Design a protein. Sequence first.
Lengths: 645, 645, 131, 131
Amino acid sequence: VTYLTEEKVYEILELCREREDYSPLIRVIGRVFSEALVQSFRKDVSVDIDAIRRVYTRLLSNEKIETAFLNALVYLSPNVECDLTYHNVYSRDPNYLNLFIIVMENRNLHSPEYLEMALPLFCKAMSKLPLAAQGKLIRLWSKYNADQIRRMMETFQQLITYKVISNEFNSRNLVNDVAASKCLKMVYYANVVGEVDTNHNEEDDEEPIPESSELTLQELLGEERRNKKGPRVDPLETELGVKTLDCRKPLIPFEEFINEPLNEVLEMDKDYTFFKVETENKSFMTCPFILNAVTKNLGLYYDNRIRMYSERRITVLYSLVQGQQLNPYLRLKVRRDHIIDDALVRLEMIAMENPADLKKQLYVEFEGEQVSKEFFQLVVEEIFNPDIGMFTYDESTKLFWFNPSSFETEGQFTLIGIVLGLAIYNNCILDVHFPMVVYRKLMGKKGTFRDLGDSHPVLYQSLKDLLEYTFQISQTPMMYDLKENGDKIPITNENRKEFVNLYSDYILNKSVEKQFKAFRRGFHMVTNESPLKYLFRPEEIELLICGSRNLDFQALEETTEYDGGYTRDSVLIREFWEIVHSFAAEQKRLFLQFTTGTDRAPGKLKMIIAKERLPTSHTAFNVLLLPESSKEKLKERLLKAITYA
Amino acid sequence: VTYLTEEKVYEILELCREREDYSPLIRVIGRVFSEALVQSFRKDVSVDIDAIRRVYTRLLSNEKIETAFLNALVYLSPNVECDLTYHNVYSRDPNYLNLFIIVMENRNLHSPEYLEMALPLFCKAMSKLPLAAQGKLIRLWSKYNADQIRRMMETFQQLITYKVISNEFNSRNLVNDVAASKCLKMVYYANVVGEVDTNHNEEDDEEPIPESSELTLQELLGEERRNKKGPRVDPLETELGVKTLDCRKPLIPFEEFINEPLNEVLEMDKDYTFFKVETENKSFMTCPFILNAVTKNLGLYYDNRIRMYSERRITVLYSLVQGQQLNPYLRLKVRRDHIIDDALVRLEMIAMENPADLKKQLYVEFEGEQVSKEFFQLVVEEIFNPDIGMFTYDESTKLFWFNPSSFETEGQFTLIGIVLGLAIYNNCILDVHFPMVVYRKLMGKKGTFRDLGDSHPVLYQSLKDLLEYTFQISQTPMMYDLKENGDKIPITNENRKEFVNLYSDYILNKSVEKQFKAFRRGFHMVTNESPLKYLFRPEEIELLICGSRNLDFQALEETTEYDGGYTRDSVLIREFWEIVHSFAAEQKRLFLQFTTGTDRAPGKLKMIIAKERLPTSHTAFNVLLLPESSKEKLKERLLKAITYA
Amino acid sequence: PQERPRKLPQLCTELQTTILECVYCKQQLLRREVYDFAFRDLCIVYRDGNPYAVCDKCLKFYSKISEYRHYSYSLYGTTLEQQYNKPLSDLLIRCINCQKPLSPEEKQRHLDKKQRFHNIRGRWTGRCMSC
Amino acid sequence: PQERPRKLPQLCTELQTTILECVYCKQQLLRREVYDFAFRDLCIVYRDGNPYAVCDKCLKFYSKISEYRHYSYSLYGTTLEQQYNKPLSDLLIRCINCQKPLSPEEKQRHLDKKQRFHNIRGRWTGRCMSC
Ligand SMILES: [Zn+2]
Ligand SMILES: [Zn+2]
Ligand SMILES: [Zn+2]
Ligand SMILES: [Zn+2]
């Protein structure tokens, strides 16, 4: 018979129980491996993972069944790979997708023989598998439990360990030689749903106020229909409805869904033009879950850098034909104690008059001074101090927050959103310590309950002990019943469920439904074209903005970029790394405030140098272009730039 | 014995004269084919083409010797192809080159079995063959007579017929898949010397007067040494000393050294950047003898067009940083009857002040008019009429010449040289009918004797009948003894040899040693960077400048470029080609003066159109953007633009 | 609004003239710029009731304005019909260089060059026959 | 002529000063532009006896002047040592972007990028460590 199944396999060991020989008994599983499971498994797919766990568990004795388990695959590779893009088999029918469970269901795919066998043919089948016949298996795949996830979380990952390092790839083979990237593009979503809910998102990310030149061009076109119908949304979740916008929980986290031996070896520079511009040949940006955050930023930096290039490509065109003034930089004007006013209103001229120039790279000017990388820490110290009144602090956790009584200086959140939007463009960190709920809200997801322990842990357990146990809570001294007549509600616990939800919707949304939004208006003004909702997870936007404390001084001693007086065997160069590597518990934390100007690390971090020569830094490039003397001269000169903080 | 030779092959047929069998008798020639001719042929190379003509002529009877003549080659291909770029065999010794005569010496290479065999392995050996071990075989190859040339002129050509059409090549395989191009690069030079003499060239092509910005940059560098040490000379003849500068005669002409099935199918657009910029992958410009002249012009047009692009890339940079005026065209100012003055002195401002802008594409302006392609025929009619006094005519032959008494209006040859240099930049013809000696002299070769029959046939036979037969000839009424006391010389014929040479050096050089040179000063000013001495033969520069009379109206009815009111099935379009193809003996010769403005054809000729609608033409683009009526309306409207010439 | 003719093919009628003023150049246009406004099919620009046109020098600029700035994404021929499944004739694609609405025959300008289609300002574009 | 120091490493001596005027900017230069004139090793510009320097804004321009105009040809690494057979240390190659004379270690800027060397004005050039 063609399809071998539950009762035909019931007596395979019984038919060789008396003769002990199994030669055509294993040929048939190398025949039923080549669509034939469908009639072999049915009583919208089969449920026979218990049934193979009656096969393989009664065939625990014969470990020669794994021969034709694997030997069927070698002809099964070009079987299911040609018929999908040349014959397009599942286009007409939704029943071609029922076969796919046979590859993943084996309990010994974790062994390296099935590593190079089971995935890459099947990922090739999963590659041209369509939007549903990938995306609807995930609905079946998320139903798998955590141990089944634990059996799955390794088995697709195990090829992504070694296939990506079999390629010692050049700039010629990025995506075409990687192929089970597109497998992992799908089966990442297994750990998405297997909490996620599309309910509690933000309101709509409103568009920028249009360019007044394009505003008249909006009288040259229709002005009413194509108002950003494509922000280049992710396509997989449009085949779902349920998104990566709102991954509240995993079963196993998404750092499992990152490969660092993949990350360095790839080409990521043109990957944004393998993303915005399309290229099937060389892509990984189209699977933004798999990039490391310290590498994901590069293309995001590049999308700005390409826009800066395109703003360098558009700065001509008013000194070109209009003959007028030329801004090949975003020139911003401030004063060191008249910043917050003049930081803002210059950008308002870059808002109502030139709403293009903000993606263009920032170059700050002053009034008195006759520089940008240090400039943000100047901004975000006075911004993130409560001298302006925008902000509180949860200094116990050292996590930062808006002040809800910034009812007028939400006009001064207008600056920082552009600034935060500009802090991500130059690829600088901020020493902003915002909680995770900011970045869920920066990715358009309004406050859940569980993000409160990021923001305010003293509210977190004090709102879930209610669950562990009246229905109104004050806010700073103003008591406010969320639910109406929440004052009179007793400590009856049936009501309390929304009281978890509403007070979490209060302090995260119903307090700052305009505060953060007037903040996010400045943010999304300059960061709309950036694919941060696409590339960055909300956790990825954290470590972009807030930065990582992996202070690796032992990087930029190896990848420094100095010229004009600092060759490889320079004397102070052969005397400086021993200074930065002579560090103790505090000398580390004071190093970076002088070089770049920050406290946490953004391995693409670099250096620059040339030729009482104290510690000097051109503080917009991490450029310590100091002079040539010995160690014991320089033993305190670095401190002298750092002592007077 | 290893090497089989003249007396060992003397008895090959004799050793099978009594037994009639020849099985190892032909293995040995498939052994001596794989360096072994050197000891087999010697008594700086072998002379044994007579000896194989004792082999093959006594082995006329056994036509199975051609088996291992050809069957040796299949292993002889990777023999001699690896050792030249990996082992570099002839680098140390000049005796590796002695082997190469065995492939060419066969009398039956013209048959198609040896076509795909004998050349491409040996051209691969000839490919990495060095500058001498190619170039010094040519000295041996030019010693071959015309019938030996006749036996050779086909046999390297016969692969270039069919190998280049075996490739139905895309824009991916131009030079790498063509390979016996580099063979033909060499063996073209066989027909160069086998008259050529490097003696009678021009004086040195003096440099342009420097750019005054670069003149100060010439005080930022050495100002004394690197004054155009490379005009990008041809390298093969620097390995000779004897050049393609001076091919006075062939034995069989160089149109044999052109392939038109090659010419169209190639990529020639980036071939200039496969020439100026170097690329081994995709080149044919580096073999400029093989291109058709109607295709060779394209890259020459492109070198201008790329310089026009680079002049489009440099026109910014004084409205960029200096903020000053912007000339993105070469704007020339004239009047329709005050041209010759004002044509000149505007370009003198483009000479002493902006000597860069002349390679940039010409866009003529006027004073009264409020256009360039027609503009040259305006120029070269009044230029090439004797109203200015620069010029005579040999109206019998209808060949054109300078007037030697243009002693002051050689200041007006200053215009036309730029103009002729600009006539070649836009790819327009001129109806200049200059003789071939102009173009030898435009390629820096002063007048030989034999070019007189190009210029003045009435002087040609009247100077060689002297040879067929006192030693002074007048010039217009001024008699002048070339040799001193050439008056008293009788009709003794020993003296007369220089009298051929000197009067040919008189009227072609010693009359116009300043006239043409003041003409060529204007020419080489704007055409120095153009590789016309590299790409164009002097015959190629003729058909570039003077144009071909292959009036193919049946081209631009198929490759027209019209838009904005002229779609493919336009009514007048389906009524116009029947007008231009309704032609008789004179309607052809009057067509082109209205469309482009010329009389001879430059298949890249195109058209343009849009929407008493008489014949109209935007006369700078061959753009007949006339209206929509029927035929019999338009039956005279074309004539009406042409009747009033 | 709905009454004012947003196409010069309809404004030649409502001007009661025979077969032209742009607000960028602030000048009076020509009949070369009445064919292409009927051919690029752009919208008539209005100045709070005052209707004007584009000139080609400001068609070649103020669309050059957005295309180097309002760039969103460009996609293969394999996808622009896939993710839309909208007819290419119905597919509102103009030109990226001259803002001419692409004929579907001219939608082989990237489909039959092994090229890609472009989208500026969320309003897809590409190359045309003139480019 | 031969007496006037064509290098500022020698003109710092003959000015009898301690470690600066350019004729393009017509202004008085700085000590950042005395190291690089000692490092780009350019010639001192003279105004009929009046010696001046370059500034970096006019080193980055008046060499940008020639490199987009006086371009002759660019060749592979396989040939620039072949047709010369001159030592790369002896090979007078400056930079194409900043006119810095290439160290032979820095002659892997095109030899070890699978790149090509350039020649402007008949005076060969290329990329350097700063570019
Ligand atoms: Zn306009
Ligand atoms: Zn166009
Ligand atoms: Zn200067
Ligand atoms: Zn440089």
